[PDB]
Amino acid sequence: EAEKEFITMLKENQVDSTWSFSRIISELGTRDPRYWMVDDDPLWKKEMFEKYLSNRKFKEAFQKMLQNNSHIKYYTRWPTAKRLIADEPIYKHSVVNEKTKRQTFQDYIDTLIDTQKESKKKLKTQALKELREYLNGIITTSSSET
Structure with a gap:
């Protein structure tokens, strides 16, 4: 459930390859509390973020x-x-x-x-x-000669 919503919020927060996992903690930690609904595993959040950058x-x-x-x-x-x-x-x-x-x-x-x-x-x-x-x-037959 957590992952599913996490993927959706990632699209909705307009996240893509031009993002760090700082922007995730800074922007996704406030835009909607889904980042907190699923307990903060920063390694899984960052692993799955590598998935969101590779697969998205x-x-x-x-x-x-x-x-x-x-x-x-x-x-x-x-x-x-x-x-x-x-x-x-x-x-x-x-x-x-x-x-x-x-x-x-x-x-x-x-x-x-x-x-x-x-x-x-x-x-x-x-x-x-x-x-x-x-x-x-x-x-x-040149044009000049008529």
């Missing part, structure tokens, strides 16, 4: 999940896109960690921004070229 080849799976998230963006920031990927199993792995997540994300953002800018530039350049090749398959 390895790198290839991470690179692949990044793309499979339907709203991922290469024109956005890590904290703004995190809500797309935190629930996904591939966000956790035996060798994955904060530093690995930053590297695989940065390489993904940099590669997908460049391929998109290049694809659009190429589309315009190719069509310009195809049109220009078309003028060179007929007699020249």
Whole structure:
């Protein structure tokens, strides 16, 4: 019962990864007495808090999940896109960690921004070229000569 409500109050107190267990004692100890309804086991509260932060080849799976998230963006920031990927199993792995997540994300953002800018530039350049090749398959005939 205690845990169930504790998870709910954690959402309601707007708690997430950007929180310490100081903010829990300071804000959750006052916002609603649920933190006191369940007796204070600071180690369980903090263990379960690690659950609330975590749950709330390895790198290839991470690179692949990044793309499979339907709203991922290469024109956005890590904290703004995190809500797309935190629930996904591939966000956790035996060798994955904060530093690995930053590297695989940065390489993904940099590669997908460049391929998109290049694809659009190429589309315009190719069509310009195809049109220009078309003028060179007929007699020249300058407009200036009437």
